[PDB]
Every structure is written in C-alpha cells, then in structure tokens.
Design a protein around this ligand. Structure first.
Ligand SMILES: [Ca+2]
Length: 222
C-alpha cells in the first residue's frame, strides 16, 4: 500500500496473509471456513494466516491454517486479468474472536465515488511506512468511464478502478488478493494496475458484487 497509513491493529479482522514460506498475497475471510482472494494469487496449497498485524512478529493473535481447497474462478483469463477471484477453503474452521472476524459479501454494487478502505502488507514505496505492519488507505471508486479511459478496452464487467488519477496513493505488489471494503462489505479484491500510484494509472479491483452467485454456490459445497 502506497501513500497510506498503519491500520489500527486488527481493525481489518477479515484480512489474511497467504503464505508459502513467506507472505505473497492477501485475502479476506468471509465465513469461518472460506477466504476470498485473487485468482492470480493461485497456488495449489497455501497457509492462511489470520489475526495478523505485524507479519514478522508473533503477537499471540494469530491463527495459521492450511488450505484444503483452492478454487480459481473458472473463467479467469490472464489477457486482461479478467475474473480475478479465487476461493480458499480452510482445512479446519477459523476461530472467530477479537482478532479474526469475517467480512460480509456485498448486498449491492457500490456506486462511483463511494469511499472505501484497501489494506495489505505490499510495497509502500515509502521511506517511512513499514509494510510489515498492515497498511490501510482510503480510496474512492472511480467511474467506469475514467477506468476504461485509463486502460482502454481492458476494463471488463468484472472490474472497477479506485484511487486517485493524480497518483501517489494506491495498492501495490504484495497487496494482491486483499480486500477493498466499502460500507463494511467486501466490494473489491486487489487485482492489477500499471505500476503503483502512477498518475493516470489507478488500481484495478475485481468487482465482487457480480460474483455473489458463483461464490455462494461454490461455498455451499462440502
Ligand atoms: Ca504477527
């Protein structure tokens, strides 16, 4: 996260770290058994780390749970990074508590100009922010027209842009798969962009609200 601030610890208790020997992507707990992340973060098995603030220090709030299932959206495409959404089933349920709480799936698609929060342990491009401590940033949803204008013909129905076209504030490498929360619901998944925090190149997010039927049907299986 570029141009943000250190989150109040555990103020984003749905935020998880996906780990394969090291942090490589974020995700969001959506109930005690499932995490939503980005398809481009796929690995066939991952360790989900919940209850984190400082991913380098053992704080006593953590739960580390291996995945049992990693499910890419069936129509994920790297041409465009389209349908950039994945479900991770936990091999055992998470214990919900002060530090670990699921975020709700959207009851609507948030409109342009809605202010949201994005968070992660990705690159901060900053001499004073510490990516080891979960970072937070408030970003507004941009219009489809501004989004498409920034990346002509690459913005599909499954994407939205959010952030600041003037630059300086954005999600970045290592934030991928993490949440965009708007009015307390998971509206976005950190997906792609040209660079980070560059003028005219806003962040692009998977648009969770149009995936709800795929998400809930997939989670209904056991
Ligand atoms: Ca920790």
């Amino acid at each position: 996260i570029v141009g943000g601030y250190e989150c109040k610890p555990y103020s984003q208790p749905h935020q998880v770290s996906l780990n394969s020997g090291y942090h490589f992507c974020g995700g969001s707990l959506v109930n005690e058994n499932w995490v939503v992340s980005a398809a481009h973060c796929y690995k066939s098995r991952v360790e989900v780390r919940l209850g984190e603030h400082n991913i380098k220090v053992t704080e006593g709030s953590e739960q580390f749970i291996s995945s049992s299932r990693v499910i890419r959206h069936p129509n994920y495409s790297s041409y465009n990074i389209d349908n950039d959404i994945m479900l991770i089933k936990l091999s055992k349920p998470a214990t919900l508590n002060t530090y670990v709480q699921p975020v709700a799936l959207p009851t609507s698609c948030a409109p342009a100009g809605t202010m949201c929060t994005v968070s992660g342990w990705g690159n901060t491009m900053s001499s004073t922010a510490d990516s080891n401590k979960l970072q937070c940033l408030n970003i507004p949803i941009l219009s489809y027209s501004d989004c498409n204008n920034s990346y002509p013909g690459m913005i599909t129905n499954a994407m939205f842009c959010a952030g600041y076209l003037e630059g300086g504030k954005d999600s970045c490498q290592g934030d991928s798969g993490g949440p965009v929360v708007c009015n307390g619901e998971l509206q976005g998944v950190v997906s792609w962009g040209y660079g980070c925090a560059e003028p005219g190149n806003p962040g692009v997010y998977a648009k969770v609200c149009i995936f709800n039927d795929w998400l809930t049907s997939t989670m209904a299986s056991y």
